[PDB]
Symmetry: D2
Subunit: 317 residues, 4 copies
């Protein structure tokens, strides 16, 4: 039988005998994702160029903000686009915190590069009046997380306690069809992904690890290199094909990517798929944040590859 995301998530919910708020949250999120996709693929563009005789990341944030508010399942919302946490109006408060990046990679959307939407969902932990502090949770607290990728097709990857499930958007009917069930990452890969133009500023251990991916001491074949420049695309490739992804800490002692709505959701997808994710000093999911836009270094992928990076990292520490 064909299965959709809303049919999938309804059935886990019922079986957990819950209140329905998480299902309503994810439904609002799907409706947002479909709206973002239709605009990313430029559905309205002829009118902008004058067929009737006469902002993407802003619009994406607007979509995601309003759909989650309208779901009655949230109380605190943290977005890459907003300086402060948005507090949901009293009459619409539900019980979840949502940290998201509504259109990651769109810095370079000029070249029609792959972009995406990243989210992680926390159960509000305190009875207190909702505030920014309700988002300062370690990622090990997540009840759900994942991303939508607007690549050659549009796909939603949702991880939960039951595992990682991939849904393809069928744009002719507006339905997210379940196409890959309970996925698992290869225990060792053959690709490495990072920006080697920063090589002059590399941590000494990053330099050495990469140098071993190109010049293996042991007569194994070198790894191939891929780096789209957009995180949802580089991570999704690592899920599907295996390997390692690096945005590590030398200047930038904390990395460049943001912990709440980039590093933690991807670290959570990775671990539920049988993979790893480190800062180099601890698991990404074990960092306790003190600021909603704070940064974290991130290294994730197949577990044999991450463990190997850590081997070399520790030889330099």
């Amino acid at each position: 039988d064909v299965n959709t995301l809303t049919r999938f998530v309804m059935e886990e919910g019922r079986k957990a005998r819950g209140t329905g708020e998480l299902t309503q949250l994810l439904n609002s999120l799907c409706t947002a994702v479909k709206a973002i996709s239709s605009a990313v693929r430029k559905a309205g563009i002829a009118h902008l160029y004058g067929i009737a005789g006469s902002k993407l990341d802003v619009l994406s944030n607007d979509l995601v903000m309003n759909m989650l508010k309208s779901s009655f399942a949230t109380c605190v919302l943290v977005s890459e686009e907003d300086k402060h946490a948005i507090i949901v109006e009293p009459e619409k408060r539900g019980k979840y915190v949502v940290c998201f990046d509504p259109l990651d990679g769109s810095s370079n959307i000029d070249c029609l590069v792959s972009v995406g939407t990243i989210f992680g969902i926390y159960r509000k932990k305190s009875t207190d009046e909702p505030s920014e502090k309700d988002a300062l949770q370690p990622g090990r607290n997540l009840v759900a997380a994942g991303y939508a990728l607007y690549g050659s097709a549009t796909m939603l990857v949702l991880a939960m306690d039951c595992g990682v499930n991939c849904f393809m958007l069928d744009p002719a009917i507006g339905e997210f069809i379940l196409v890959d069930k309970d996925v698992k990452i290869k225990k060792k890969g053959k690709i490495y992904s990072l920006n080697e133009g920063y090589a002059r500023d590399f941590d000494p251990a990053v330099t050495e690890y990469i140098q071993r991916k190109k010049f293996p001491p042991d007569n194994s074949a070198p790894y191939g290199a891929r780096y789209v420049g957009s995180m949802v695309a580089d991570v999704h490739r690592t899920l599907v094909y295996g390997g390692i992804f690096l945005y590590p800490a030398k200047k930038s002692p904390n990395g460049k990517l943001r912990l709440l709505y980039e590093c933690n959701p991807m670290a959570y997808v990775m671990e539920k798929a049988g993979g790893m994710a480190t800062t180099g000093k601890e698991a990404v999911l074990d960092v306790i944040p003190t600021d909603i836009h704070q940064r974290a270094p991130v290294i994730l992928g197949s577990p044999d590859d991450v463990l190997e990076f850590l081997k070399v990292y520790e030889k330099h520490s």
Copy 2:
């Protein structure tokens, strides 16, 4: 005032007082392209998972091949998908030879990477019965070339003598809308693109050129790196942002990886019409005389200051 591809190409031909054949060719290609875009974004995929109770490479090739034949404007078709050249049947033959990759980058459609269609159009030059040899012309004989990119959005880039023009596919009405006219590549960029996993196979020229981009002897800012692994996406980003793209030879035969007829030549044509450059290292890509329809070539292309810098290094090691 709004312009669409159909209207732009019809106008260029009208004041060229031509015969309509090329316009009929490009229109056929536009239909195929929009049909490919639909299938790549998966618009009927639910029927495939049983919604009513019960290969993207091959469909893309069928769509191009049938629509081109349909056009009455071609005689020889060369496709990445077919071992030998296709000869159009007598009753549908026109005067153009077409070389194309119907879905470049489809190797990695599994991870949903950008994919694209690349084409190059030649006037048949010989007066012989049409044959594979009609498609063995040097890239400098092209009358038209370009690519459809299925990325975050779907865009057609079309190069001709008039220059380079960029049309965005509006899916709501299914029309290609002119949005960047007579585009030109920046003289020098700040991004370099190549698969650095072949580092132990690069020749001394590539090795030194790369090192100049990470460690500038003039102490200017190092270049950033990007490599999608899908040629149409990397090349289009080179057009739009500047910089350089490379696929040099390696121990996968010293002949390079990318195909001359339907990958390197159409992109090199796009780049030179945009004020850029494209070299094998030994010669310009557009001057290679082919001997085989699927032969490979190495390519270094992009902004002109960046390819020239590459070429001054290559000369120092020559």
Copy 3:
């Protein structure tokens, strides 16, 4: 705040502390409606005409039958297309009985007339093995009924004991957006709808009633006439503008042409929950106790003033 079909129905169901099985049925039926819409608007027709080289009501039935079975919410399925009830196999069996017309008005799909999908849902009470007889229920046993209208736009109209709501399908995102809430029909309208070519076969009650709409007894403005010929379209215009719709018994004996279980009962239900009426002439449509799943019934529905007027003239003629 924007609302949708999924969110509206999932909240009514949580409020009722139900099992969510009715929601599984409705979500699955909404999927089927969206694919029927796509096919009715001809979203792949170019492939049928050969662009790559190489039934609508049949496919609508296949869509509804397979989506309903996999909801795990039905046990007996009655369709205009099928001679007998279909009995869902044990492993997929749920408590609801559905009767539906998967693409009504399909006879004139050649002229691009509006068509639609009609449905009505009963709870199965007993403990017995499911059987065709479980669908032989009066329409007052309905827990939900409605229709999808494929007109200038596609719209879903859904009636439950909480009232009638109307959801517009947004093709760009594939979502049913609530646009009219808790809808109520005009007390009295100014339009009447029937196939008047059967004038020579009308009951005297119908002929007087019609002549009272053209030569009214009180110098009212005569009514206008509209008859599209596709039931879903005629009934929806009646819901939105007011007036009366009639399919009486011509030669067809005091029986008429339309079908009681999957045409007459769902529209009678939508009319009554929206404050209208529906009568056979002799009784309320929703009171008829049926003995055959494909039995027919006379039907007269619309604004309550207009139906009371006809029923007044009807009684004078008995």
Copy 4:
């Protein structure tokens, strides 16, 4: 081979060795129709209902007026929405005059009735500076006409000297696929279509003919009745299934209701190229010489046997 509007019309101009203006005109009109269809089907409607926090006849007229101007092929434009004809600015002037109804039948779009776009194309016969007089030609002077029907699917019907052809829109790729070539209407049909609610004001001529359809004298089968209320829908049905459609004179207007320049005349041309007829009662629609651009005309059209039969009943009563 699969054929599209743009390829059909382009090949028609080639054989005539034309200037490209009429092809430009129809290309721009098709683009306007695709955007109308997307709008009519409510493609971005959720944004209206607050999905991101923060008209239809106006938009259609805007789309048609702007695309026609941008086509470089027109000089005077008449639309139902504008009291005065639009004069195209000198820079953008071409040789054609277009009369159109941008969204016919839009009044009752709220009940999701079929709607459509009607057009008629004349060549400017005069010599002086272009003026509203350039639209006051008889329908006999028409170079081409037709309509778009926004029904269950969207179809453009196209009429010129080579006959009538029907192109279906495939919304997945936005191409108009030719699906019925050189169509011709049946010699005699079995359907009559008119607003019978105004029977109290009928000409004695149509009250006899209409009774001949419900009580045939030879005791053959009586006709069926259909009236949508939307001209483009009722007329398309007549073209496809045969029969007769009526909006006659009486005293609601001695000159009927529909407008001659952009409703009756395009539909009279389509019919006559299809082997049908179109009369005012007094004369053939296409022979009236207008004196006002917005003037009205009675219309009786359809299958030729049917219309001659109406004419005789009308010849009798005068």
